[model samples]
Target chain A: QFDLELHELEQSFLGLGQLVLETASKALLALASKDKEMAELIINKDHAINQGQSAIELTCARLLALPQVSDLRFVISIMSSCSDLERMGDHMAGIAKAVLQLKENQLAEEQLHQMGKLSLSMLADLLVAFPLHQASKAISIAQKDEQIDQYYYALSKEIIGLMKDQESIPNGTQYLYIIGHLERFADYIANICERLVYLETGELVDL
Target chain B: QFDLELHELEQSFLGLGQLVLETASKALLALASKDKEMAELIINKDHAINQGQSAIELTCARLLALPQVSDLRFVISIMSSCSDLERMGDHMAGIAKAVLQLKENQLAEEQLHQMGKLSLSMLADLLVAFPLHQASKAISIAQKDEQIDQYYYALSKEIIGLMKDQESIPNGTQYLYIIGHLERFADYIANICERLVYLETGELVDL
Candidate 1:
């Protein structure tokens, strides 16, 4: 019975995690490629993200109240994970809005594609590493995030330079907002990594 | 007796609400003003935010475990609010990070100042309005967020124009980062308000 309930908690956490990741993957693809078909799909699919968030969180809440729960802290930790992933849901919507707002395939000719790819992978890895509570290569996540940070810094320089060019203004600004979400994606994934560290070793340090 | 558990949930919600509010307000103030003492203080004080989040959420999970607990939905919803507010705690750290990164460089004063105030105010009100489970307040919040949106649009127009000026480049770009956090505060508040609508009426929405 204990194992069954614990599995339930883990299940809901992963459920929400998968939803946000799909949103991240699709939303960034829509942003990078500016595919109207894909962007429209993200717009429609966000409903599921919202629903998944609501459903799983409600499940976790009900599970929290069950008697004889041995891992209350772990359940609470799962709740925290749900909330973080849901906010990523919100981030997903933001980029989808950007994609819809822009012209067709309007990404800055290969701009932010690399960064977007890295963020999606890192976030996926972070989510996977989280429930396992064994981020053996925690510092590798750290190294990847630092590389993403450099991409952000370089992107900023490029953005500023391109913003000065009148022709590139709209795409430049739109891409800026899109990439902001991507940058946030990296840091947030690190946060999930950070939480895994705390949960595993019971240490409070940022990677 | 059920009321007692509900009240306990409310008290924890309020405790974290106030902590996050102080963190958001002070952290932004320190970011814009570049007060080294203030920024460093937010950096140092962040651990408390982390601890408070962990402690209260764990308590919420335990409260969920108690038999005969009424208003399970309300208890769960408050846990959701705690996570949203906690993300703002991370934003506090992000702003402190910005303060450190910029050193003497800072964004322009008037627009960001008002935007910061708007975001802080929105989150503060939303936190209080949540446990009340009222939708009347929801309408008012949506109205205020629209005003914030308008403010953001105007700011973006201004940002587009200013980015061309080489001298403004340094401040212009950094301010964009700060403003992004402010923008997120509104959308997050709106999400909470949307949940309040759900809690009150069982109609999930995107208000």
Candidate 2:
């Protein structure tokens, strides 16, 4: 029964990660299109991620209550990853809300799109790496977060440059905020990668 | 052994929270002073919080591995609070780094200072309410985060207005970023409050 319960827990966690990836992808799509209806849907849909986090956390507590449960590292990693994934949902919903504000007035979204694609790609790879316990793969994936950080700083500088123009101030501020969200998404993926590494190797690492 | 271990864990967690609150306050002070040395110290100092988090998390896992243990919810709350407190440390370090960037030219510090004071006050109050399991006090504290959110938006809008003048763009960008950090600090405190409520009441309510 404990083994089955552990399996169920991992399944639920994976399901939550997949849900987060889809929501993040859709959030980017909504940002690209500036679709009010889709953005509203994504904002409203974030509660599901919250519920998933709570359910997973509760499961972790319940499993911990068992008299003789092993795989404590895996359980802790799952709980930690749920927090990261839920924050991604919050960021995604934030992007969706920013889209609603843009209302057809799109700014310079080139680098933002790149950051989004890069982060989502990393998220996808994390989905594969987590269940496999590929520590090496996770380390390499975390290395990619440095590139995202580079993109973030460059993008923020560029936004600052754009903000120098009087008329562009409002849109520029939003772009800066949006890119911050994107950068944070990648950072969370890096965190999950580190967690994956720890889950497999039983060695806590800061990736 | 379990009871003493639990007490030690709680004490360590409290120590970590106190460390974070002090770091956050110092980070704000460094920002206001634009003191590069203090900023660097705070940046380097963040590692203690990370180490504290790892230690606490490891303790939780070890305790959970025991054949019999009660207070599952309390252990879970401590683990969850560790994450929140760790993030607050990250935000504090971020503000310190931003201070290093600002270097001496003080921009509009009034609202930023207010936000910092308010968030730190909330964090300080949290340190008190946590050990007492004061759910009502926690709820009231969480309600204050909404006010911080309002300050964040207003200050962001004001910074955008300042950015319209070309000469003010750089500092304005930093101001926006710093206030965002301040706002996030409050959000983490709100998260801890929610966890405290759950720890006390055995019910998870979104505050």
Candidate 3:
């Protein structure tokens, strides 16, 4: 009976995870397209994500409060992973806000496309990594964060060079700021992967 | 017998919390005073904080895994609070790095002092609130995070004003970034308080 309940809880938690990933992807897409209306809609969905996170946390707490089997590892894993997923939602919301701050006419389409693609791919990889319980894939994805960092650094270099040359692109600093927002999103995703590895192996991997 | 063990674990976790608070305070002082040597020392202490956090987490996991008749609420509360304390340590380490970055004599003395005072006071209050189990005090202390935000805004305003008046302040944007780091530290402390409140009453408090 307890194992059955635990299975149900895990399934529900996965559903919450899916919701977070979907909202994050949509938020990124809205930013890439400079769709203020869509971005606003995506931003509002953050409240639902927050609510879902709270629900998951409360459910985990309730389960932990009850008597259970000796195999407590699964419960601990779900609790920690849920918390990480919730924080990832917050980071996505932050990225959406940063995107909203960018003037529609001033956005660099190429840069936005690159950032959106990388972030979406990273999120998709993380979603797959969690359910498959693939520790190695999660670790690799976490390390792949360096690629996002490189993108951020390269983009900043280009922007700085332009600024130095007195060739001011419209709202270029805002684009640079959006890149930073995207980089932070990548870091949060990497953090989730780290948590996943810890959940599975009971070991913290330094990345 | 179980109560005794729980008490000991709580005390140990509190010790880690105090160390983290002191480390953050010292880090802020090091930044304000431009003491590279002190900043490096604080940075080194972060490794100790990480070790302590891991120890606490392992201990909690082991305790929860065992069968016991003691109130599960008490166990969950302790573990939840300890988790927050551990994350607070991580945020402190981040702040310590920011302090190290500030040791280059790039930022204004007054701005650093303002950030130093606010961060130090918040850290001190959080430490006190934890041991006292004073939820209201924790909430109020967390609410004071607005001051940190206002200070950051004021610093940015002053920097922009200076730049508009004269162009001699080199790397002014970098200084603003450091100020933003301190503001983020304040946010982390507020997060700690939010966690504390939730642990106490199982309710969410908005910061």
Candidate 4:
């Protein structure tokens, strides 16, 4: 019975994770394409994500309040992972909001697309790692986050250089802002992987 | 008996909240005044915050695992509040790291000071609300986060205008990045308040 319950809980978690991944992908696309309508839609979905998170938390609370010994760890782990997933959803929503703010301005779409691709790939890797319980793989993917940071730093420098070019400063500044948000999103994904490693091995991976 | 544990946990949580507030204040001062040493110290203290969070989580897990009946609601409430406090510390550390980055730039002292004051006041209000369990009070402070958002938005516009006028943009661009970081810190505080309201009342607040 406990095994059956754990399976059901894991499936719910997987569904939530997929929702988060989709949200992040859509948000990034909206930002890169300058689609205000899509950005607004993504922003609206943030409320649903919050609602999903609360529902998961309520379930966890109910499980904990009347848990059998056999299902305790499973419930706790689900609760912890659900919280991480909720936070990841929030970061995606943040990117969507930033994209909305930049819709009126021109930006470096190519660079934003590249950063989005990188982040989406990271999210994909994390999704794989989550169900497989592949802690090492997650940590390895987390290490790649530094590449996102490098892109962000280089983009910031390029924006500064564009400031000198007089013609590009307006759009360049907006690109810098978007790139920073993307970088931070990557960092949060890395954080999720880091927590996953701890969840699996009871050790903190410093990468 | 559980009430005693609840009281002790509350005290620890309040202490952590104050620490987070102080850390944020010192970090903002460090940035506004270019106190590199203080910024570095704040960065180092992030490890302590992480350790504290881990310890608190372990305590909560242990408590929740036991078959305790009296004030179970209170115990869960304290655990949820502790979790939010831990996250608040993480945001404070993020702000501190941003402050350390801005230590290299000597401009934007006045704007940083104003932003610092705004965040510091918010932290003060949150600390007061936590012990009282006044979700409304916390929600009100969370609403004030929009003021920080407005200020940062105005500051960013001013910086962009300055960049447009000046041939050199690197310094101004860096200043904008730090301002963006401060704005995010305020948003994180608002998020904590929202979490607190949800835990206390099982409902979401508009802020």
Best by TM-score: 1
lDDT of 3 by residue, B1-207 (tens): 777877788788779878877876776666556677886776676667656766776566566544432334455455555555555556555555655555344435676687768787887877767766677988999888888877865675566455434553444644655665677677767777876776577654445
Which residues of candidate 3, in runs, are more than 4 Å off?
A1-10, A32-44, A62-74, A94-109, A132-135, A147-184, B1-11, B32-43, B58-81, B94-108, B131-136, B146-181
**lDDT, candidate 3, at A129:** 72
lDDT string for model 1 (A81-189, tens) is 6656756676677788877778654435454778878877877777667667775755567569878767866776576565446346566667666766677667667
The TM-scores of all predictions, comma-separated, are 0.82, 0.78, 0.72, 0.76
Candidate 2, residue A145: CA error in Å? Answer: 4.0
Give me the runs in candidate 4 sitting further than 4 Å from their true place: A1-8, A29-45, A62-77, A90-108, A149-184, A201-207, B32-37, B67-84, B87-108, B151-181
Off by over 4 Å in 2: A1-8, A65-70, A98-110, A146-180, A200-207, B1-9, B65-71, B97-108, B132-136, B146-180, B200-207
With candidate 4 superimposed using the best TM-score fit, by how many Å does residue B82's alpha carbon deviate from the native?
A: 4.0
Q: Is candidate 2 or candidate 4 better by lDDT?
A: 2
**Ten-residue stretch with the least lDDT total in model 1 chain B:** B64-73
- lDDT per residue as tens, model 1, B49-149: 76776676666676665543236657666766666666667667777776766735434668777888888888778777766778879658756887776
lDDT of 4 by residue, B1-207 (tens): 766776777777677778887887777777666677887787778667656655665565556645433344445455555545555566556556665555343444566678778888887888778777677888888888878867775676566556446533555656666666667677767766876676577665446
Candidate numbers, best TM-score first, in rank order: 1, 2, 4, 3
Instruction: Tell how far residue B172 is off in model 4, in angstroms.
Output: 6.8
lDDT per residue for candidate 4 within A22-128, as digits (tens), equals 98888877766678889788878877776776677555655554454324445555665666677777777777776666635443557657777998898888877
Order by DockQ, highest first: 1, 2, 4, 3
Residue range with the least summed lDDT across 10 consecutive positions in model 3 chain A: A64-73
Candidate 2 clashing pairs, residues 3+ apart or interchain: none
B187 in model 3: Cα distance from truth in Å? 2.4
